[PDB]
Amino acid sequence: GYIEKLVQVNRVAKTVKGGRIFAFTALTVVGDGKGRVGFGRGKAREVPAAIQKAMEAARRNMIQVDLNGTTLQYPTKSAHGASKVYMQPASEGTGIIAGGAMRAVLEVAGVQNVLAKCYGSTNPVNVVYATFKGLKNMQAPEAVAAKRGKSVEEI
RNA sequence: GAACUGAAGAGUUUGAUCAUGGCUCAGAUUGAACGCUGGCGGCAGGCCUAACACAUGCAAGUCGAGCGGAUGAAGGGAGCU
């Protein structure tokens, strides 16, 4: 029941005494499609081995994002290493308006109605980190009331 | 009651990477022009340049119930008929 999406497949290389060796790196994002999400990387000599190594690595590193329900709660901005990302909640109906690098993350994480924009560098590995940090730091209203020691009357 | 609901990125420096950084593209539009093609209708638009020169025809006339003269009928009377 885990929906898996491929963000990118990249061909990296290193040089040795005589010629070069080719390695394929793939980064994928996994999640239940409602409340769970996880991303991982994997390097292997071949693409069928490469995309697979990312699979277990993604499923082993997942969190619990606290969505408002079919959408995100509050407009937030998250950054990780010269990759700035802004995401804003949207009303029912509008699709996933986000870059293809992060569009997989929101769509897999269960978000279906959101407005997002990438600022700064658009490296797919780093933007995935940025949106992940924003989604992880997401706070539902009852949690904020617990921090301030009040009811949901703070709204 | 409504006058708002709104934001995508990609390619390209390297053996390969991250960043910075420029270039190019995917969009909307036009009083548009060119090429290929071409059935109709509604609505609209149509010298953006030489405020260059203009043939031709019209685009500012009207009032006789303001005024003077001319043209001077209908209708009647006469030579001839």
Q: In sequence order, which residues have a C-beta less than 8 Å from that of residue A121 and are 6 or more positions away?
A: A81, A82, A83, A127
User: Which residue in the block uniquely carries the two structure tokens 């010629």?
Assistant: A19
State whether the beta carbon of A16 lies below 7 angstroms from any atom of strand B. no
State whether the beta carbon of A103 lies below 7 angstroms from any atom of strand B. yes
Residue A151 is encoded by which pair of tokens?
């009811």
Whether the Cβ atoms of residue A57 and residue A43 lie closer than 8 Å to each other: no
State whether the beta carbon of A15 lies below 7 angstroms from any atom of strand B. yes
State whether the beta carbon of A116 lies below 7 angstroms from any atom of strand B. yes
**In the structure, how far is the CA atom of residue A136 from the C1' atom of nucleotide B5, in angstroms?**
27
Q: Which nucleotides of B are covered by protein (CB under 7 A)?
A: 5-10, 15-20
**CA–CA dist A83, A134 (Å, integer):** 12
Q: Decide: helix, strand or coil at residue A42.
A: strand
Dump strand ranges (E) for A16-107. 20-31, 36-44, 62-64, 76-79, 83-89, 96-97
**In the structure, how far is the CA atom of residue A154 from the C1' atom of nucleotide B46, in angstroms?**
63
Measured at the alpha carbon of residue A78, what is the angle toward residues A117 and A90, in degrees to the nearest 5?
50
H or E element, residue A120: strand A114-120
State whether the beta carbon of A14 lies below 7 angstroms from any atom of strand B. yes
Q: Which of A144, A155, A68 is nearest to A113 (CA)?
A: A68
User: Looking at the DSSP assignment, which residues form a beta bridge with residue A11?
Assistant: A24
Strand order in the sheet with A114-120: A76-79, A83-89, A114-120, A96-97
Measured at the alpha carbon of residue A121, what is the angle toward residues A118 and A124, in degrees to the nearest 5?
75
**CA–CA dist A28, A123 (Å, integer):** 14
Instruction: Name the burial class of residue A145, with classes exposed (0-12), middle (13-18) and buried (19+) by CB atoms within 10 angstroms of its CB.
Output: middle
